[PDB]
Amino acid sequence: TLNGGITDMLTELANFEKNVSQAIHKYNAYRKAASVIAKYPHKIKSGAEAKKLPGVGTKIAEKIDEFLATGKLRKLEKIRQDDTSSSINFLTRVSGIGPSAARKFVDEGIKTLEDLRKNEDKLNHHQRIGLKYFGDFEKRIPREEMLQMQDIVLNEVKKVDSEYIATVCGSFRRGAESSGDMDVLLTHPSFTSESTKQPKLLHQVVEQLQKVHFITDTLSKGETKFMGVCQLPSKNDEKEYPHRRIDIRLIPKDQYYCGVLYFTGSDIFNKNMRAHALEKGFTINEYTIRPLGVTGVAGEPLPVDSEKDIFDYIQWKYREPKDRSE
DNA sequence: CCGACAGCGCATCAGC
DNA sequence: GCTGATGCGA
DNA sequence: GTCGG
Ligand SMILES: O=c1ccn([C@H]2C[C@H](O)[C@@H](COP(=O)(O)NP(=O)(O)OP(=O)(O)O)O2)c(=O)[nH]1
Ligand SMILES: [Cl-]
Ligand SMILES: [Cl-]
Ligand SMILES: [Cl-]
Ligand SMILES: [Cl-]
Ligand SMILES: [Cl-]
Ligand SMILES: [Mg+2]
Ligand SMILES: [Mg+2]
Ligand code: NA
Ligand code: NA
């Protein structure tokens, strides 16, 4: 939080470019800068100082000087006063409503939480659940609760088949004291890059979690990725816990390490690592790390037996999960 | 300058 | 029904 | 918006 003021500004700018301008690259440019500045171990005294960092160019350097001097950014001050921008930014906060649907809804006069509620009919399934739990999905999950949730998930999974391995990844695995949601990497020996000897592997787990009333709603669901909602059980006379978002990813067991690396993130860390990979001549996804031929075409999967092996291929020293929070 | 910017699963749609 | 483009989110 | 060649 040394440069909290500056990172918030850059984040707001990023959200504006993504939600309103629908300019994704500007979105990522701003996020990269906020990220590199978030880890800068000094209290930034000037844009020039910030420009030293990779990701911070002339435009952001100027904005930082304006922020350090006045404590604000006129450009943002103006964005905040624009109704269309305010409405669009707001609507995108509903899970399932992106920049397009948000701008679309505004054209139709649907601009507030109140409007969304009297217009459920105009929403798809995902947007409907997002609206339903709008408030809850805003709340962070104390790690203490993450521990309880982990307990339930691992124990319920074990009950379906002792051969399943469920690993909580995301910010939890990185040691965060609070998480935005719970991310679970799932594996089962029957499902490998070689074959799927058992269908419904993801379904069965979802089913079991719904049975014990842990999973309450489903945003989306396929053979390998589940996007849903869950809730910790509460005691008698005790107020109910907020509903939580839960993501589950079923990955071939022989590709666990590439899968655990991906799902542990962060997303910016993954973006930096994959980009670095390309430069070194490799391509990395959640399943494998492949070399890039002279043509650019990816080759065959390289042997991987630990997260570290992936780091070695691209000539990167190993970084513990707790240090991948970019 | 100018092309590149990480990679991909699920939902939904147009075109056939 | 299929396939491919697009939105959305991870 | 920023970067590398
Ligand atoms: O754009 C994305 C989003 C997510 N991911 C990966 C990394 C991230 O850590 C993981 C889980 O996604 P979340 O959106 O749940 N983020 P995370 O768990 O890191 O943080 P939070 O506490 O917000 O959930 O998926 C990407 O690679 N790219
Ligand atoms: Cl852009
Ligand atoms: Cl401001
Ligand atoms: Cl692997
Ligand atoms: Cl692959
Ligand atoms: Cl995912
Ligand atoms: Mg998460
Ligand atoms: Mg998640
Ligand atoms: Na710089
Ligand atoms: Na949204």
- DSSP annotation of A303 reads P
Question: CB pairs under 8 A, 24+ apart, for A168-173?
Answer: A169/A260, A169/A263, A169/A264, A169/A265, A170/A247, A170/A263, A170/A264, A170/A265, A171/A265, A171/A266, A171/A325, A172/A143, A172/A146, A173/A260, A173/A263, A173/A264, A173/A321
CA-CA distance, A120 to A102, in Å (whole number)? 14
Q: What is the fold, at CATH topology level, of the domain defined by A1-82?
A: DNA polymerase; domain 1 (1.10.150)
Asked if residues A314 and A273 have their Cβ atoms less than 8 Å apart, the reply is: yes
Nucleotides in chain C near protein beta carbons (<7 Å): 6-10
- DSSP annotation of A82 reads -
Task: Please state, in angstroms and as integers, the Cα–Cα distance from residue A91 to each residue in A7, A104, A106, A127, A254, following that order.
Answer: 23, 10, 9, 10, 41
Please state which CATH number belongs to domain A83-139. 1.10.150.20
CA-CA distance, A11 to A15, in Å (whole number)? 6
Assess whether the previous peptide bond of A266 is cis (omega < 30° from 0).
yes
Domain boundaries, chain A: 1-82, 83-139, 140-262, 263-325
Asked if residues A249 and A224 have their Cβ atoms less than 8 Å apart, the reply is: yes
> Which residue lies with its CA nearest to atom 27 of ligand 1?
A267
Q: Which residues contact A249 (CB under 8 A, 6 or more apart)?
A: A183, A184, A185, A186, A224, A225, A226, A259, A263, A286
| Cα of A118 vs its chain's centroid, Å | 30
> How far apart are the CA of A102 and the centre of ligand 2, in A?
18
Footprint on protein of nucleic strand B, Cβ below 7 A: A 25, 28-29, 124-126, 220-225, 227, 267, 270-271, 274-275, 277-278, 283-286
Give the 3-state DSSP-derived string for A187-221, with helices as H, strands as E and coil as C. ECCCEECCEECCCCHHHHHHHHHHHCCCEEEEEEE
Resolution (A): 2.1
Total residues belonging to chain A: 326
- Segment holding A152, helix H or strand E: helix A143-160
Same fold, A83-139 and A263-325: no
Nearest atom (ligand 1) to Cα of A181: 24
Nearest atom (ligand 1) to Cα of A264: 9
- DSSP annotation of A249 reads E
Task: Please state, in angstroms and as integers, the Cα–Cα distance from residue A177 to each residue in A145, A146, A169, A174, following that order.
Answer: 10, 9, 14, 9
Please state which architecture CATH assigns to domain A140-262: 2-Layer Sandwich (3.30)
> Which residue lies with its CA nearest to atom 3 of ligand 1?
A267
Asked if residues A82 and A106 have their Cβ atoms less than 8 Å apart, the reply is: no
Nucleotide nearest to A271 (CA to C1'): B6
Is A271 among the catalytic positions?
no
Phi-psi region of A96 (alpha: psi -120 to 50; beta: other; left: phi over 0): left
Q: Which of A139, A143, A225 is nearest to A177 (CA)?
A: A143
Instruction: Tell me the three state secondary structure of residue A232.
Output: coil
CA-CA distance, A61 to A108, in Å (whole number)? 39
Tell me, in Å, how far CA of A114 is from C1' of D3?
Answer: 44
Please state which architecture CATH assigns to domain A263-325: 2-Layer Sandwich (3.30)
Task: Please state, in angstroms and as integers, the Cα–Cα distance from residue A127 to each residue in A15, A94, A214, A249, following that order.
Answer: 19, 7, 21, 21
